[PDB]
Amino acid sequence: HETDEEFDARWVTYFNKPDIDAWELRKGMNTLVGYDLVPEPKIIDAALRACRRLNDFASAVRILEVVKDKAGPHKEIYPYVIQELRPTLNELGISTPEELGLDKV
Template sequence: MLSTFRAPLMRALSLRAVTARSYSAAKESDDDFDSRWESYFKRPTLDGWELRKGINDMQGFDNFPEPRIVVACLEACRRLNEPSLATRYLEALRWKAGKDAKVIYPWLIQEIRPTLDKLKIATPEDLGYEKPEFGLKSVFEMKGPNDY
């Protein structure tokens, strides 16, 4: 009795797993990706929650956003009166650049500097947030008892 019930159940579960994997998104070009996110942040109906969701989704992608997307996001932050979110977004972009942050992040700031000045948005470096205020030294930088 149990084996006659188990076989259709297992077959249904295996079919369900296959159908869950059968759909996927079409390949999107870089220009389409940039245009989609730029228009997302430029929507007049965008609210604070959607802005945060868009930033979070962008951080999850395995690419660095183009300056035009960053500009659209910063304009949305200013439009929604979220200057602190704009600064935190810039900080997140610096962390997203990873080991290439010394090259990519200054280039990005150079590209978006006119927008930052126009919108009066401060970068983390302008505010002194590039290093923690009360951060401890790394244990590898501390002196040992024989170093004095």
């Protein structure tokens, strides 16, 4: 197929479409989590800003949960991804699932 960088750039481009609609947002995340990877921060970043243009706070939070879930028992991945997303979280006022209490069973 293609390099890692080309895979990521294609996904970044997908979510960065200015008039991305709600259906494309869902289709893109539901497809993306079928792969054997945790998405790069720059992909999640483009998907969070797409949530912002669609005025959908709750799906921004759900996308953070699914990053954490795709990492399985590799517990170092989620905290690294949140770290890299902080300036975007701060800029858009996205609270994480932990700051919301939504990580409690």
